Amino acid sequence: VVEAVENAVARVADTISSGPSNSQAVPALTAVETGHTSQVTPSDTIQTRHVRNYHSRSESSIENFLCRSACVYMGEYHTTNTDTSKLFASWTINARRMVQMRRKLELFTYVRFDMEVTFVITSKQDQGTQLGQDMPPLTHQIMYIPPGGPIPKSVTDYTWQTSTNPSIFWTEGNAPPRMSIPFISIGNAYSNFYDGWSHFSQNGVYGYNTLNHMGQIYVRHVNGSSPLPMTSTVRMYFKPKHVKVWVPRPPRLCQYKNASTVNFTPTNITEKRQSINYIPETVKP
Amino acid sequence: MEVTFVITSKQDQGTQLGQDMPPLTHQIMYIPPGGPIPKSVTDYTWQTSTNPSIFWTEGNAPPRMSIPFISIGNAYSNFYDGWSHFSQNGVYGYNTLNHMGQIYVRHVNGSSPL
Amino acid sequence: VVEAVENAVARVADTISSGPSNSQAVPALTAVETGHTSQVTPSDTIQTRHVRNYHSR
Amino acid sequence: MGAQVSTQKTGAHIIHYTNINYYKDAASNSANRQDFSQDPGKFTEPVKDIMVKSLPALN
Amino acid sequence: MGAQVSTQKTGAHIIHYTNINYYKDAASNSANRQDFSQDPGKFTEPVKDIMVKSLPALN
Amino acid sequence: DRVRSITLGNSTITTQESANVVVAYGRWPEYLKDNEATAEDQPTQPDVATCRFYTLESVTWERDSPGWWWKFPDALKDMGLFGQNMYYHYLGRAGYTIHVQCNASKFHQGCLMVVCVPEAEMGCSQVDGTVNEHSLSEGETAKKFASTSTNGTNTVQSIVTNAGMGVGVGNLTIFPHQWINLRTNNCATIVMPYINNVPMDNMFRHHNFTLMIIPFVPLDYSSDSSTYVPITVTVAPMCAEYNGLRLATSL
Amino acid sequence: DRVRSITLGNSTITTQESANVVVAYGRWPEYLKDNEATAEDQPTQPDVATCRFYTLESVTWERDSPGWWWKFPDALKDMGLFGQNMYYHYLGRAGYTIHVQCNASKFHQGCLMVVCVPEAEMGCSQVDGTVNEHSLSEGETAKKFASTSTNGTNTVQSIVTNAGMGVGVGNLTIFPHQWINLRTNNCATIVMPYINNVPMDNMFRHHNFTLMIIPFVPLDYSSDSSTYVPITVTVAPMCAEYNGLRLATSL
Amino acid sequence: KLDTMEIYRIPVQSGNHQSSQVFGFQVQPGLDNVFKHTLLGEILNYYAHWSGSIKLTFVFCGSAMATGKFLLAYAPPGANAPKSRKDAMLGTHIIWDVGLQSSCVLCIPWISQTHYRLVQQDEYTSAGNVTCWYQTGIVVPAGTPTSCSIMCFVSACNDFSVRLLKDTPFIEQSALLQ
Amino acid sequence: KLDTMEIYRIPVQSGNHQSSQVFGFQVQPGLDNVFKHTLLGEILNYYAHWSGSIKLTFVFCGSAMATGKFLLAYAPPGANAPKSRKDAMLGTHIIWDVGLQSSCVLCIPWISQTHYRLVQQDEYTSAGNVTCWYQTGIVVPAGTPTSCSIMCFVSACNDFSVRLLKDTPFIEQSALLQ
Numbered sequence A: 001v002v003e004a005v006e007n008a009v010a011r012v013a014d015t016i017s018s019g020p021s022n023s024q025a026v027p028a029l030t031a032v033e034t035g036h037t038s039q040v041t042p043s044d045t046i047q048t049r050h051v052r053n054y055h056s057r058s059e060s061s062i063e064n065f066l067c068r069s070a071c072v073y074m075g076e077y078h079t080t081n082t083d084t085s086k087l088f089a090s091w092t093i094n095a096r097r098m099v100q101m102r103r104k105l106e107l108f109t110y111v112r113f114d115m116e117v118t119f120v121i122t123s124k125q126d127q128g129t130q131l132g133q134d135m136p137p138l139t140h141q142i143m144y145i146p147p148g149g150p151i152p153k154s155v156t157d158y159t160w161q162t163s164t165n166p167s168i169f170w171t172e173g174n175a176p177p178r179m180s181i182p183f184i185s186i187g188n189a190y191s192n193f194y195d196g197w198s199h200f201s202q203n204g205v206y207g208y209n210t211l212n213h214m215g216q217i218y219v220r221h222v223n224g225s226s227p228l229p230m231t232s233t234v235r236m237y238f239k240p241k242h243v244k245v246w247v248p249r250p251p252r253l254c255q256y257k258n259a260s261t262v263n264f265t266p267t268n269i270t271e272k273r274q275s276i277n278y279i280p281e282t283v284k285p
Numbered sequence B: 001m002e003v004t005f006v007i008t009s010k011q012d013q014g015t016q017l018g019q020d021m022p023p024l025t026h027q028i029m030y031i032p033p034g035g036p037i038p039k040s041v042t043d044y045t046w047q048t049s050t051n052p053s054i055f056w057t058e059g060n061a062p063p064r065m066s067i068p069f070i071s072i073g074n075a076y077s078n079f080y081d082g083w084s085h086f087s088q089n090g091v092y093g094y095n096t097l098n099h100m101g102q103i104y105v106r107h108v109n110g111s112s113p114l
Numbered sequence C: 001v002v003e004a005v006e007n008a009v010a011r012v013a014d015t016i017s018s019g020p021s022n023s024q025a026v027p028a029l030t031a032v033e034t035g036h037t038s039q040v041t042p043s044d045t046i047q048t049r050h051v052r053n054y055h056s057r
Numbered sequence D, E: 001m002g003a004q005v006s007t008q009k010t011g012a013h014i015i016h017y018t019n020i021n022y023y024k025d026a027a028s029n030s031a032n033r034q035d036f037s038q039d040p041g042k043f044t045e046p047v048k049d050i051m052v053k054s055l056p057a058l059n
Numbered sequence F, G: 001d002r003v004r005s006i007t008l009g010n011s012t013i014t015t016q017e018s019a020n021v022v023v024a025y026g027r028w029p030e031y032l033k034d035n036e037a038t039a040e041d042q043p044t045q046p047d048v049a050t051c052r053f054y055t056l057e058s059v060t061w062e063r064d065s066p067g068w069w070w071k072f073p074d075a076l077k078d079m080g081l082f083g084q085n086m087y088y089h090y091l092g093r094a095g096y097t098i099h100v101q102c103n104a105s106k107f108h109q110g111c112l113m114v115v116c117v118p119e120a121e122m123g124c125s126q127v128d129g130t131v132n133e134h135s136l137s138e139g140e141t142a143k144k145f146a147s148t149s150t151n152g153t154n155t156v157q158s159i160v161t162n163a164g165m166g167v168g169v170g171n172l173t174i175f176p177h178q179w180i181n182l183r184t185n186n187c188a189t190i191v192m193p194y195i196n197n198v199p200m201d202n203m204f205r206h207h208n209f210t211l212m213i214i215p216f217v218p219l220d221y222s223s224d225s226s227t228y229v230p231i232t233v234t235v236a237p238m239c240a241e242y243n244g245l246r247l248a249t250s251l
Numbered sequence H, I: 001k002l003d004t005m006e007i008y009r010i011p012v013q014s015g016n017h018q019s020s021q022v023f024g025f026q027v028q029p030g031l032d033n034v035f036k037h038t039l040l041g042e043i044l045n046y047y048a049h050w051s052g053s054i055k056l057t058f059v060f061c062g063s064a065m066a067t068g069k070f071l072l073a074y075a076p077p078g079a080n081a082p083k084s085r086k087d088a089m090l091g092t093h094i095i096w097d098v099g100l101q102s103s104c105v106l107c108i109p110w111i112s113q114t115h116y117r118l119v120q121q122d123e124y125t126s127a128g129n130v131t132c133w134y135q136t137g138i139v140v141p142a143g144t145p146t147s148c149s150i151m152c153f154v155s156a157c158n159d160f161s162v163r164l165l166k167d168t169p170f171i172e173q174s175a176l177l178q
C-alpha cells in the first residue's frame, strides 16, 4: 500500500496594475486610535505594474523557526578525586541557562511540543608530571530521575540499578546518543511566564520555578578505574518538534541576570546619531 | 552542492615521545554573514544554537552534507565588470557579489600535553 | 507503487552514401564574414559509404 | 506497507519522496516542516466593526 | 512506495535499476546524469536570414 | 540580398554591401514580463526618445593599429534623453543594435573582427594592483590596445594577443561577432539582447558588455591610393525601461 | 464627503478637509488624436517618470501680505525627468493637477483665492517700456504682488487691485478657481487641461497659464496663537507628450 | 534622550520654518539604529535576506485647533539625500493634510535590482532614504500651545518575506547560569 | 612571432612560386602545437579519446583585384609527407578558386582502423597530414600590393565525440591562493 499526501505551497500576494485616480476614496487616511493596522498596498498610493510573485514564506513558519538543536547545559565530572561529589554530574532540567534558545522561546507565552535530545561527551587527561599509559575505552551512564525518585549519593550507590528509571549507556568513539521525549506537563501547555505565587497567602516562591518540576539528570563513569585521573565534560542539546505556540510577546531587550527571575538592569532604547536629520553621504568622487 | 571534508592529524616533533591518546573529535561550524565570530577555542559562540555544525571523530568515514543554491541573484556570477560604489570606484570585480559566509574548525578535546 | 521512467539515448548522426556529382550546387563555398559556421559533412565533398554510427555524446 | 509519498520542496519559474514510520509512538516521528497556514487578521484587525480601507475610519 | 525504475547505461551492436528518495529536500537527491539534449544552432548559426548550404552565401 | 535598411525612431541606416545580421543567441530584445519582475513600481518607457541610433566619434585605421574597445553602457551617458533617463533612475534595462561602418576601394586590403563580449573583466599591468575606471573607459572616445607588454601603474595590461583578459585572441569567436573583409563587405551588424544574472541593474555601476574591434590582417595599399581610412560605430537602444525615480546623481 | 485621495505615478496626496474638485471647463486632460495632429514624427510618452506630483517651495502668509504668482511651465523646468524631457524636445504638451495646502487652527481667520489664468499677459511699471522675463518669473520661487503703485524701471506694475493686467481683481472669478476659508477647508484642487490655439507648442517660449494666490481677508489671530502659517503648492503633469528630439538647449 | 519617552516624538511648531527639515533617515530595516529594535527589525535580525514593501504610518498629536500640511518623500538609491523641498518633491511622495482623520500612510514600494537584499545592508544593496518637510506650516489660534509632536509606526506589507536563518547579535552571556 | 598577430597569417604572393609549398602540418587536434590551444583543442585536452570528422575553413584576405587558385590536400598515414604537388594530388584534395565567395572548406573524414584515437597521439593512432600548393599562382594588376595572406579556421563536424575524462596539463600552481 502507498498513500499520496498533498502539500499546498503558500506564496505571497501578487501586485496588480493600477492607474491614475481622482475620487473620494481615501485609502491612505486612517486612525491608529482604533488599535487597527492599515491594510494598504503600494497599488493604493502610486501607479504600479503587474508582477507575478513566486516568493514563499516557508522558512518563517514556527516549526522551521524552532526545529534546530541548541545547547542547554554543560557539566564536568571526574574519575578520581577526594570529594566523591565531583565523581558524577547532576542538574535540574530546564531551558533557562543558555541565552540564545531561551530568548528564542520567550517570544511566546505558552508552548507545546515533543523534544529530541542529544548528548555530546568528551574526555581529557588531567595534568600530571608522569604521563604514559594505555587506557581501555570509557563507558558513561546517563540516568533521568522524575520528581520523587531516590537520589544517588555516590558513584557506587544502589540507585544506579535503574530498574524503572530510563538510562543510556554509551562508549566513546561512537555516534552521539539521542532519544525523543513526549509533551510531559500536568497542564495543557508549557508556561514561559507566570505572574503568581506558590502559596495561597500571596507569598513564597514567585514566577517560573513554581510550575516546571520536571526531574533531574545524573551522569557518571562506569569503569571505576584510572589510577591516573581523567575529566569528562557532557553537553546537552534540545530540539523541539510538533510545535504549537500562543500569545506573542515583545522580544527581550535587556540582558539576562540569572536563571530564576526576569531581573534586569535598565538599558537604552537604541544608540545615538548626530541629529534628527543626519544622513551619511555615499556618492562622492 | 555536495560537500565533503577530509581531516588528518599528526604528532609534533618533540624529543620525548610515548603516550597513549584517546580518539580526537573535531567541530566544523558554518557562519553566514552577520553572525558572531569566535575569538578563541573556548568562546561561547561554539554553542552553535542556530548555526549548523558537524561533530566528527577520527577513524570513521569522511563527513558529508549537501547545500542548496544560495544566492540573492538568479544565478551565480563568475565575472563581474563593475564596482561596488555608485561613484564607479571602491572594490572592482568578483569580491563585490559573493558574500557567502565563513567556516571555522577546532578540536573539541582541549587536551594533549604533547 | 512503481513508476517507469524512460531515458532517451542520444547518438551521433549516421553518414549517408554519396556518389559522383557535376552541378551548380557549391556546398564547399561559403563566407565567414557573416559570423556563421559551415554545416558541411564529408558526404558533400567526397564519395562515401553508408555507416551506422552508435557513438553517444 | 504503510508508505507515504509526498512532493519535495523545489523552485519555480522524480520530485516526490517516500517515508515509512518505524516506531509505535508518534513522538518518534520527524518534524512537520511542510505546513504553511496563516491568519494575520487575529493580530492586525482585532476590531468589532469592520473597516473597509477605502472609507474614512471615523465619522 | 514511490519507487522509480529506469534503464541502465549499456552498450550496443535486468537492464533497469530502482531508486527511492529518502529525504524531504530535493537538494539531497543524486545527480541527473541521464539527460542528453543539444541545441548547437544557438552558437553556430546565429543569423537572421537562413543559409541553405547548397546555395552561395552572398549574391 | 546585399542591400539592407534599418529604421528606429527618427533614424534610418541604409547599406549596399552587407553580409547578414547576427542575432546574439537567437534571442531578440523584449520587455520584462510579470512572472520575472521583482521591482514593484510602474516603469517608464519613452520608446522613441531613447530607442534610436546614436553615432560615436571615429577612429583612424593605420598600417600598424592594434585595435580598440568601448564599454556599454557609459558610452551613451551623454547621448540625448537616454543619458538623461540614466541619470534620474536607479534601475535600467535595454537591448542594442550595433552597426560598424568602414569602406575602402577595390585596391585596398585588410580584415577586421567585430565582437561583443559580455562581462569583460580586465586586469592591471601591475599584477599586485587594482584597476581604476579611467583606464577602463573614456566614454565616447575609444581605448587603444597596445603592441607589446605594458608597464607603469594604473594602466590596463593591453597587449592585443591576450585581449587584456588572459585568453587567446583567436578564440574570441565564441562570442557574437562578425568580420569586415575589405574585398567582401563594408559593414557589420549585431543585435544584442539584455544579458545579466538579475532582471534589472544600475547603469553607472556595471558595464554590461564590451565592444572590441581588432584587425587581423593589417591595412595595405599602393602608390597613390587613399591613405585615410576611418572606422565608425553607431548604436541604438531597444526596449528601454527604467525604475526608481529620484534626484539626479552626480559623477 | 470631505476626505479625498489622489494617486499619480509613485506619489499620493491625502486630505481630510477638502471642499470638492474643480475641472476647469468640464474637460479632463487627454492625448492628441490623429485628426487633430500636424507634426508627423512618433511622439514619446514617459507616463510615470513625468506624470507625478512635484512640490515647490513655500511662502509665509503674514498679516499684511498682498499675494503671489507663478508661471507654468518654467516653474517645473528643473523638476526631475519632466524638465529633462523639456530640454531635449522642440514641442511639448500636458495638462495639470494643482493642489494648494494651508492649515490653521479654529482660532485663526482668513480667506484666500486660488485662481489659474490662461495667457496672463502683464504690463510694465513704465508705460513707455517693455517687460523682461526675470520680472515675470523666478522659477520655483514666487513673485510678490505689491501694496501700492510700483515705480522704477524693468519691474512689473504689481498693485494687487489691478492684478497686473488692467482689470478688477474681484472679477477673476471668471477663471477656474477655488477659495480657502480658514474656518471651512484647508486645501484647494484644480484640474487643468491643455488650452492653446495650436495643438502643441514650445515650452520655454510660451507661458501657458499663471497661478495666482490672493488673500481677500487678511490673517488674524490673538494672544498666544501660532504666528507662522505657511502656504504650499504641489503640481502634477498629466498626459505629457513631446516631439522634435535634438540636442539640449541652453538658457 | 536614549532612556526617555522623548526618543519617540518628532517636534514641529508654528511660524516660518519652511527652510528647516523635519526628519530624515535611511531605509535599512535591520541595520539602522532607527529600525533595529522594533518588532519588524527584531524579526529580521534572525534572518539574512529580506524582500517586500514597508508601511510607515504618521500620527499628529497636537490640539484640535491646529492646522498644517506636510510632505513625506522617499528617494531611491543612486544620489545623495535631498537638501531642500524642491529636490525631495521629485521622488515618491505624499502630501498629508491634518484633519479629522489623524493618520497618514507612506508606503515604500519594493524597487530593487535583486530579488532579495541583505539584512546586513552594504552599499551594493542600499535602499534609499526618507525625508519630511513643511508643505505649508502650522497655524493655531490664541490660547493653544505652539509646539506639537508627531509619531511614526512601522510595519510590513502582504508581499514581505525573509530567508536564511541565523543567530541574532543582540543577546549574549559570559558564563552559564544567565 | 609567438606574441604577435603575424602568428595567424599565412603568406602568399604573385610571381613564379609553384615549386614552393604554402603550408603543411600534422593532424593531431590535441597534441600538435598548431591545434592545441584552439577551442577544439582546449575541449579535447580534458578527455582521453576522440573520434569524428574535422572541418578546416580557409579565407583569402587580399585585394578585390587579385586572382588565384590553390590545392588543399590531406594524406592518410602510412607514408612520408609529400614533397611536391604531384605527390600531394594523389590523396584527398580540393581545388579552391578565389572569387566573390571568400571561403573554402576542406573536410577531413574519419579514416581509422580503430573506433577512437588517443588525444595523446602516438605512432599507432596517427592520422596523417595536410599540405597546400599553388595550383596556378596569384595574378594582380598595377597599383595593388603584391603580398597577401590567408587565414584558417578549425571546427568539429556532427559525428564528433570524446570520452574518458581527465585533468588538463595547461594549468598549474605552486601554492594555495592562486
Ligand SMILES: CCCCCCCCCCCCC/C=C/[C@H](O)[C@H](N)CO
Residues within 6 Å of the ligand: A093, A094, A095, A096, A105, A111, A115, A117, A142, A143, A144, A166, A167, A168, A179, A181, A184, A190, A191, A192, A214
Ligand atoms: C536519560 C534519558 C532521557 C533523558 C532525559 C531528558 C528528558 C527531559 C525532560 C523533558 C523536558 C522538555 C520540556 C522542557 C522545556 C521547557 O518546558 C521549556 N523551557 C519551555 O517551558
Ligand SMILES: CCCCCCCCCCCCC/C=C/[C@H](O)[C@H](N)CO
Residues within 6 Å of the ligand: B001, B003, B028, B029, B030, B052, B053, B054, B065, B067, B070, B076, B077, B078, B100
Ligand atoms: C558546517 C556544515 C556546512 C558546511 C558549509 C558549506 C556551505 C558552503 C556554502 C555554499 C557555497 C556553494 C556555492 C559557492 C561557489 C561559487 O559560487 C562558485 N565558485 C561559482 O560562483
